Design an enzyme around this catalytic site. Structure first.
Site, PDB file in Angstrom:
ATOM      1  N   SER A   1       2.423   8.721   4.034  1.00  0.00           N
ATOM      2  CA  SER A   1       1.717   8.537   2.774  1.00  0.00           C
ATOM      3  C   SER A   1       2.675   8.868   1.643  1.00  0.00           C
ATOM      4  O   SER A   1       3.146  10.004   1.543  1.00  0.00           O
ATOM      5  CB  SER A   1       0.470   9.417   2.701  1.00  0.00           C
ATOM      6  OG  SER A   1       0.094   9.630   1.354  1.00  0.00           O
ATOM      7  N   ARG A   2       2.957   7.874   0.795  1.00  0.00           N
ATOM      8  CA  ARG A   2       3.931   8.057  -0.277  1.00  0.00           C
ATOM      9  C   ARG A   2       3.412   8.978  -1.368  1.00  0.00           C
ATOM     10  O   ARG A   2       4.211   9.544  -2.123  1.00  0.00           O
ATOM     11  CB  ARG A   2       4.315   6.713  -0.892  1.00  0.00           C
ATOM     12  CG  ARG A   2       5.335   5.911  -0.109  1.00  0.00           C
ATOM     13  CD  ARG A   2       5.407   4.503  -0.668  1.00  0.00           C
ATOM     14  NE  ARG A   2       6.038   3.549   0.237  1.00  0.00           N
ATOM     15  CZ  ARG A   2       5.429   2.973   1.269  1.00  0.00           C
ATOM     16  NH1 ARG A   2       4.171   3.254   1.553  1.00  0.00           N
ATOM     17  NH2 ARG A   2       6.077   2.106   2.027  1.00  0.00           N
ATOM     18  N   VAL A   3       2.093   9.127  -1.487  1.00  0.00           N
ATOM     19  CA  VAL A   3       1.569  10.089  -2.445  1.00  0.00           C
ATOM     20  C   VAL A   3       1.811  11.505  -1.943  1.00  0.00           C
ATOM     21  O   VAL A   3       2.084  12.418  -2.735  1.00  0.00           O
ATOM     22  CB  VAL A   3       0.081   9.825  -2.714  1.00  0.00           C
ATOM     23  CG1 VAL A   3      -0.376  10.615  -3.910  1.00  0.00           C
ATOM     24  CG2 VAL A   3      -0.153   8.353  -2.940  1.00  0.00           C
TER      25      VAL A   3
ATOM     26  N   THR B   1       0.819  -1.196   0.000  1.00  0.00           N
ATOM     27  CA  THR B   1       0.000   0.000   0.000  1.00  0.00           C
ATOM     28  C   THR B   1       0.861   1.258   0.000  1.00  0.00           C
ATOM     29  O   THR B   1       2.001   1.260   0.468  1.00  0.00           O
ATOM     30  CB  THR B   1      -0.909  -0.012   1.214  1.00  0.00           C
ATOM     31  OG1 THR B   1      -0.106   0.002   2.394  1.00  0.00           O
ATOM     32  CG2 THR B   1      -1.724  -1.265   1.212  1.00  0.00           C
ATOM     33  N   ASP B   2       0.301   2.334  -0.559  1.00  0.00           N
ATOM     34  CA  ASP B   2       1.048   3.577  -0.701  1.00  0.00           C
ATOM     35  C   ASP B   2       1.305   4.221   0.647  1.00  0.00           C
ATOM     36  O   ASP B   2       2.395   4.737   0.900  1.00  0.00           O
ATOM     37  CB  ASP B   2       0.306   4.549  -1.612  1.00  0.00           C
ATOM     38  CG  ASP B   2       0.364   4.144  -3.064  1.00  0.00           C
ATOM     39  OD1 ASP B   2       1.358   3.513  -3.469  1.00  0.00           O
ATOM     40  OD2 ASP B   2      -0.585   4.459  -3.807  1.00  0.00           O
TER      41      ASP B   2
END
Ligand SMILES: Nc1ncnc2c1ncn2[C@@H]1O[C@H](COP(=O)(O)OP(=O)(O)OP(=O)(O)O)[C@@H](O)[C@H]1O
Ligand SMILES: Nc1ncnc2c1ncn2[C@@H]1O[C@H](COP(=O)(O)OP(=O)(O)O)[C@@H](O)[C@H]1O
Ligand SMILES: [Mg+2]
Ligand SMILES: [Mg+2]
Lengths: 365, 177, 281, 210, 277, 52, 70, 105, 52, 52
Positions: C217-219, C191-192
């Site tokens: 959160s990688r976004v 998951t991101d």
């Protein structure tokens, strides 16, 4: 809706749903069966509906003690008065082979489900130690040509436990309030049988060993037991806010336990000594002497009303009783009996003597 | 006049009434001393006990037969059954004599007491022995002291104390045996 | 601090009783309020799949969704614990197929896999009963391919294929903060994001109990509301400077009277992130 | 099925009904423990079968308290309110004094704070610990045990510091009339007709401790 | 999950060696002050055999001085005299006297502000930075002497040994207002002492009680320093025993977790192999 | 744990190594300051059980 | 040095090195017990600090320089 | 070690003597029996050991007793594997040991 | 009964049961082999029994 | 941590007694006289009990 149980930590921190499921998680010697006998002695008399006590793999001597209790307490009436009785025991206790302990929970559940469906009344299913059902299935499953799963258990643990535990629920026609002891195997809550059993219980009440080692009976861990009724939409805001306050103080004490063990209470600041003092008072105050524990202690058991729980615990959270010591809250009914024990506690600290003469122990009377 | 009956032994019972009963009574400096004032005796001949003191050290507690105190009305000698005395001392030399031996100690200014039991309590701040003082920079210290003369009364008091202390050091370094 | 964009698989992982389901239900409940304000094209259609949950719990959530009006936009795929393990193996996938219709036709979708750590158990039951050899703890080695075939279907497609999206929310139950467990260590890499919930923060008052040092959160801030980017850019720094000044002052040793402010400033922020049960702001 | 092994082994130790002969059977399973952990597999299995425990601590055995009964963890709730009642009069008070000694010995792991009434507890508990411990292979009947715990739960033994109670127990066993032992055995409990004799004999004792 | 209990053993073992070092520090520094406390005990007996001991006097204004430590590793020391401050300040109040509570030491303002803040004026800190010197005592005495109370009370722990710390009240009275008044027994018991001052007795008793306050405050902030080293010694050998028993319990739990992990991952291999062949 | 201390990138300064760290390959002035930074960080790591 | 042992021991050690290594490892064994006290450098004991600085002498003595065989 | 027990049994029963035995490092006898019982395909027990640990150690240690003919006293060096007395090799060893003798550095 | 091996410490403090089992918690260089050889020599000299 | 001359007279006699007992537990061994020179001394039990 609420189920009033008359236990302090139970009615405050993890209150029981009248149409739900009730779990007791115990570690061999923390007193889940004594707690369930006090839950019987409180609930099953006032709750006038039928009760089913299905013993799944506990001690046979406790089954005989329950039979001799429920005969002479009017729960089971023998002879010509068999109709007036309010309990039906299904007993597959631990001398039975693991075929028979693997289905006696299903037998007690079928006796409860006839009272739910056809009769249509509210049933109290008191399953004793539902983990032994999983143990009997695991003992069978080593021989059934299957592969062992996690720690030693069945590959088919989850669907079997679901196929039992989703029967014990309250339909449109009847209600089954299920009180189940769940023996944890070796004080190991990551074991797959209690880990699967946590997801099926409406109001889990976990009993710990360390709190029993401090003598606090019942040894309910106040920071890991919870309910779904612990929400401000069903119990009113005062009860929920006092519950969140007492859990906040207990969590802060369990944080401070490391620095208390290494350094002591001397190193802490004065507000943290206030938090620790309040936390020790509310930590002893969850203890009560039970009405079933009076057969081995001599202390008379105390039923605690819910308003008296909310009064005493709100008072020790805000600070109305900060002057009282720790031992005034140990083995007490409620906040009237706390100050009544503080009267007794003070009184003996000076009057300890003066029994030399005016005794019957002369020779001639 | 003396309407407050205080005392350490009376303080125990007035401490027992307001404080909670779980604590021991705190101690007092009367419990840490045994050589009292009106305890009659404590002379036993010509050797009277001398309690020579200092804040950072204890240089003498043994018994002497003569002590000469540099009092502000002059140097005066203390004998065995001496008068009860509260004496403010000039900066000068005290003279410790036990008999045939004589040791002299320069004192910096501080009180000295004799109580009715013939015991003495010499109480001075810096009791410098004459072997660790110098006769060289004392004249330069007076030359500093006989130079800075401003109008402040505070500096006048400190500078006059400097003149008297340095001149006493000169008088107690030039005439040595 | 962990803002969630459309096309992001964001993991909601906690202990047994943390705010896991309730922080997911708030994302479904709030999509009643937004979709009564946004136009037709950018509407989010939630799908909450229940894997291995109690059947009374699913009847409470459809009681809740019909009580607030969220059932107008929500599919509720229930694989209760009465269902056999080949059903609960399948129901995250079939929930995704019911949600991928909205990613097929240009709308935006939302799917919440409730307790994927019970999908792996229902896959563990068949693979140990079809005589496949067990690997880790009892799980076959392809239990990563169990979830990666599923969670990687949540995507934001390109503008020639309709321009749709599908936001996932896998839910993972650990045991005692055991993020080193085998099933959880698969999903954290997939998951991101990660929203790690801790129970000892949950009883200290922090509700939702977002362990804010461990939630990323990688976004990132490319996919959040523009008004909150410039403002809360110091917020994750102001909580970061709260923890190590609270990691030193716990002994009762010493204060600095200016780091006392930065511990006080974080305390006006720690009590600021608390929210109620079913409240969308 | 190890749980079923120990269960079907131990479950045959019963007290049968009055129509089935009225017999009985008492088990004493002994479980070897490694580093004193109660949370093993076999220990927590057999605890959930047995009606009680007798915990023998290693630290209490190393300090010369032999037998090393950890009275905190050792519970047996079927035998209490089923035992010899003449013991059970003084034994509840004995339980409270041992529990108080456990609590104040945990509260003073080192001696720095003296309260002069908690020291009465710390004296009484180290007296009773010395009274209860015994030498090996030495059975003591219940009538010579009720008297030795009666003369220690009360006063009559605070005259020694802690040491010569190893002589004082056999001293009070020797110096009482052995007629009272028959009375306390046959009666079952400490009647006031025997309580006044028990208070009467216990003050003329030539105690070797002074 | 087996990496937590090894690094916790690493933490508790070095905490154990830290306190095993600081018990050496405190028991060493207790001895280098022991060559000075009995020397600073020299000037505390002549004033009390001269002025007597009169604590329970109805003063109108009084400066109670509760001298505490600097570093908060005391161990039954700072809060002890904090409760002793109100316990000896409450038995002395009967008619509403002016009270100026003064605390010496950084651990005085942290505790005495809670119970008595409205009568709290001076907090003297960093007094044990290098050592204790008599001119520091004269300066803090003069900063008390800027106000003119009717008495003084000095709360400090008497270092008798490494186990017993009985707190003491050292009493210093106002010279003409209360000191000469309290000696009035059938005249005056001070007048048998013949004065050898420059001016009258009334301004040599001022000098005498200022010297008495300075000496006894020096003795107080030396005895509290030596009992602070003794109490940090008695507290660092309880933290060493605590980090010994905690390390033993965590080593037992590490061994049990080691055995459980190796048995489980061996069971994993055997269940993988026998279900294959 | 370095990422939780906010150092981005979260390169572990001690256990990151290379075979290009020999002073006969890269010159000595690089290897001296690199081993100095490693020593200073290792002293800070040994000290942060007492600073904590 | 506290863990790495040779079960042969000093019986096959080079003599002359045997004259000095026995004192070397003795001071180092005292050093490893007086180790983790160097952070309290302000507090001396005047003899534990001598063996502490001698352990700091010897521990920085035995350093090598990357294929420097002596 | 069974050959050692045989020569010791000949010196005990036939020669009538008071024999000493020295099982060198009984943990390696445990390790050799663990290797031969993992070799034959038996399922290994706790932490890594043979399932026949207790009985095939008691087959060794129970020929070491007193007899009416003579005696055998055996002095076995015991090494603790992780220096843990909860390990099953010293836990199954120490239930036979009568007197321990700690050698110190 | 007791086995008199001749050493004062292992005959006084932790006696050797004649016919029982003995545990040595040795090491390296602590003289365990010299202890073994002295035990053999003493038992063969006094008690008339061999060793293996 | 206090000093060698610090302890009382009731204990330091036992300090001397333990420091002369602990060296007395040693023994010259007859198998080591091939490289120690001093011949061994086999000690009886009753002599050990009485002389201790
Ligand atoms: N934001 C919140 N504020 C206050 N209470 C909350 C909040 N969120 C959750 N809770 C309470 O915490 C409890 C647990 O919440 P939740 O339903 O998320 O548990 P859970 O982890 O989903 O349990 P399970 O995973 O077994 O279903 C519930 O009783 C709920 O009332
Ligand atoms: N309310 C109580 N008061 C006193 N003792 C209790 C109480 N509840 C439990 N206990 C103790 O817990 C012990 C174990 O209780 P029980 O329920 O029989 O064990 P288990 O939980 O294994 O069935 C009992 O010996 C009893 O003394
Ligand atoms: Mg039970
Ligand atoms: Mg959930």
């Amino acid at each position: 809706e609420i189920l009033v149980t008359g236990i302090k930590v139970v009615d405050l921190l993890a209150p029981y749903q009248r149409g739900g499921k009730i779990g007791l998680f115990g570690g061999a010697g923390v007193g889940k069966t004594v707690l369930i006998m006090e839950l019987i002695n409180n609930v099953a008399k006032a709750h006038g509906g039928f009760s089913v006590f299905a013993g799944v793999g506990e001690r046979t001597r406790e089954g005989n003690d329950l039979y001799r209790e429920m005969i002479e307490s009017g729960v089971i009436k023998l002879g010509a008065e068999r109709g007036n009785s309010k309990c039906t025991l299904v007993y597959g206790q631990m001398n039975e082979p693991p075929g028979a302990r693997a289905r006696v929970a299903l037998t007690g559940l079928t006796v409860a489900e006839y009272f739910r469906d056809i009769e249509g009344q509210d049933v109290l299913l008191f399953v004793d130690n539902i983990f032994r059902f999983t143990q009997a299935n695991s003992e069978v499953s080593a021989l059934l040509g299957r592969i062992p799963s996690a720690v030693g258990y069945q590959p088919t643990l989850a669907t079997d436990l679901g196929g039992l535990q989703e029967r014990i629920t309250t339909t449109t026609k009847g209600s089954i309030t299920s009180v189940q002891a769940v023996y944890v195997p070796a004080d190991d809550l990551t074991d797959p049988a209690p880990a699967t059993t946590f997801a099926h219980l409406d109001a889990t009440t976990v009993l710990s060993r360390s709190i029993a080692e401090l003598g606090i009976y019942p040894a309910v861990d106040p920071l890991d037991s919870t309910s779904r009724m612990l929400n401000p939409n069903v119990i009113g805001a005062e009860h929920y806010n006092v519950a969140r306050g007492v859990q906040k103080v207990l969590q802060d004490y369990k944080n401070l336990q490391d620095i208390i063990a290494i350094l002591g209470m001397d190193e802490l600041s004065e507000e943290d000594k206030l938090t620790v003092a309040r936390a020790r008072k509310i930590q002893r105050f969850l203890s009560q002497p039970f009405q079933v524990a009076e057969v081995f202690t001599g202390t008379p058991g105390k039923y605690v009303d819910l308003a008296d729980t909310i009064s005493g615990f709100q008072g020790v959270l805000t600070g109305k009783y900060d002057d009282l010591p720790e031992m005034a809250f140990y083995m007490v009914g409620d906040i009237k009996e706390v100050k009544e024990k503080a009267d007794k506690m003070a009184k003996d600290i000076a009057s300890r003597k003066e029994a030399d003469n005016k005794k019957v122990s002369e020779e001639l009377k | 006049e003396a309407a407050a009956p205080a005392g350490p032994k009376e303080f125990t019972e007035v401490w027992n009434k307001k404080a909670p009963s779980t604590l021991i009574v705190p101690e007092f400096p009367s419990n840490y001393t045994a050589v009292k004032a009106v305890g009659e005796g404590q002379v036993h001949g010509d050797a009277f006990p001398v309690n020579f003191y200092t804040p950072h050290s204890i240089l003498s507690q043994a018994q002497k037969d003569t002590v000469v105190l540099p009092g502000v009305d002059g140097y005066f000698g203390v004998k065995a059954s001496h008068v009860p005395t509260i004496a403010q001392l000039k900066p000068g030399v005290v003279e410790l004599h036990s008999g045939a031996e004589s040791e002299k100690f320069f004192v910096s200014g501080g009180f000295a007491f004799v109580h009715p039991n013939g015991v003495t309590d010499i109480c001075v701040l810096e009791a410098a022995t004459l072997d660790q003082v110098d006769p060289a920079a004392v004249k330069s210290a007076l030359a500093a002291a006989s130079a800075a003369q401003p109008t402040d009364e505070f500096e006048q008091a400190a500078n006059r104390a400097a003149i008297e202390l340095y001149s006493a050091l000169e008088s107690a370094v030039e005439a040595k045996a | 601090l962990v803002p969630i964009g459309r096309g992001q698989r964001e993991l909601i992982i906690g202990d047994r009783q943390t705010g896991k389901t309730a922080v997911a239900i708030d994302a479904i409940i709030h999509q009643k309020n937004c979709n009564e304000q946004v136009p037709k094209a950018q509407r989010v259609y939630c799908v909450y799949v229940a894997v291995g949950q109690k059947r009374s719990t699913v009847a409470q959530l459809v009681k809740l969704f019909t009580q607030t009006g969220a059932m107008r936009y929500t599919i509720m795929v229930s694989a209760t614990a009465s269902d056999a393990a080949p059903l609960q193996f399948l129901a995250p996938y079939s929930g995704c197929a019911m949600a991928e219709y909205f990613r097929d036709t240009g709308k935006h979708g939302l799917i919440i896999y409730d307790d994927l750590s019970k999908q792996s158990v229902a896959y563990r039951q068949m693979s140990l009963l079809l005589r496949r050899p067990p690997g880790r703890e009892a799980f076959p080695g392809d239990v990563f391919y169990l979830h990666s075939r599923l969670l990687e279907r949540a995507a934001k497609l390109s503008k020639e294929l309709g321009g749709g999206s599908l936001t996932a929310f896998p839910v993972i139950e650990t045991q005692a903060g055991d993020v080193s467990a085998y099933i959880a260590t698969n999903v954290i890499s997939i998951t991101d994001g990660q929203i790690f919930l801790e129970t000892e923060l949950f009883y200290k008052g922090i509700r939702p109990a977002l362990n804010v040092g461990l939630s990323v959160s990688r976004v990132g801030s490319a996919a959040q509301f523009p008004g909150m980017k410039q403002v809360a850019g110091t917020l994750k720094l102001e909580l970061a400077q709260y923890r190590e000044v609270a990691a030193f002052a716990q002994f009762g040793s010493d204060l600095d009277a200016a780091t006392q402010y930065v511990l006080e400033r974080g305390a006006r922020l720690t009590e600021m992130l608390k929210q109620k049960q079913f409240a969308p702001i | 099925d190890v749980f079923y092994l120990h269960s079907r082994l131990l479950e045959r130790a019963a007290k049968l009904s009055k129509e089935l002969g009225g017999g009985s059977l008492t088990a004493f399973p002994v479980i070897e423990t490694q580093a004193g952990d109660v949370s093993a597999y076999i220990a927590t299995n057999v605890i959930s079968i047995t009606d009680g425990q007798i915990f023998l601590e290693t630290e209490l055995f190393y300090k010369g308290i032999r037998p090393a009964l950890n009275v905190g963890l050792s519970v047996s709730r079927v035998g209490s309110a089923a035992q010899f009642p003449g013991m059970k009069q003084v034994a509840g008070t004995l339980k409270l004094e041992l529990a108080q000694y456990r609590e104040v010995a945990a509260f003073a792991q080192f001696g720095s704070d003296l309260d002069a009434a908690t020291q009465y507890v710390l004296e009484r508990g180290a007296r009773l610990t010395e009274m209860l411990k015994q030498k090996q292979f030495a059975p003591i009947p219940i009538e010579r045990q009720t008297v030795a715990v009666y003369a220690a739960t009360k006063g009559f033994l605070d005259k020694v510091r802690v040491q010569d109670i190893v002589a004082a127990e056999e001293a009070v066993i020797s110096q009482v009339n052995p007629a009272v032992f028959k009375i306390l055995k046959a009666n079952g409990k400490i009647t006031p007709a025997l309580d006044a004799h028990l208070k009467a004999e216990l003050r003329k004792v030539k105690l070797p401790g002074a | 999950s087996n990496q937590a209990v090894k690094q916790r053993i690493r933490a508790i073992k070095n905490i154990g060696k830290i306190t095993k070092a600081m018990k050496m520090v405190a028991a060493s520094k207790m001895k280098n002050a022991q060559i000075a406390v009995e020397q600073s005990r020299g000037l505390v007996d002549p004033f009390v055999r001269l002025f007597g001991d009169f604590p329970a006097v109805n003063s109108n204004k009084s400066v109670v001085v509760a001298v505490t430590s600097d570093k908060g590793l005391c161990g039954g020391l700072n809060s002890n005299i904090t409760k002793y401050t109100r316990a000896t300040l409450a038995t002395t109040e009967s008619e509403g006297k002016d009270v100026v509570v003064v605390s010496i030491g950084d651990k005085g303002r942290s505790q005495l502000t809670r119970i008595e803040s409205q009568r709290y004026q001076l907090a003297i800190a960093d007094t044990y930075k290098v050592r204790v010197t008599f001119g520091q005592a004269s300066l803090i005495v003069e900063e008390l002497i800027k106000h003119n109370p009717q008495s003084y009370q000095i709360l400090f722990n008497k270092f008798r040994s490494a186990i017993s710390f009985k707190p003491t009240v050292a009493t210093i009275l106002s010279p003409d207002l209360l000191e000469k008044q309290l000696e009035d027994v059938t005249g005056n018991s001070l007048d048998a002492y013949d004065i050898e001052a420059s001016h009258e007795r009334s301004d040599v008793l001022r000098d005498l009680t200022e010297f008495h306050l300075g000496v006894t405050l020096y003795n107080a902030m030396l005895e509290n320093n030596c009992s602070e080293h003794a109490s940090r010694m008695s507290a660092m050998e309880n933290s060493t025993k605590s980090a010994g028993e905690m390390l033993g319990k965590l080593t037992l739990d590490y061994n049990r977790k080691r055995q459980a992990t190796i048995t489980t991952e061996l069971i994993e291999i055997i269940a993988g192999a026998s279900a294959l062949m």
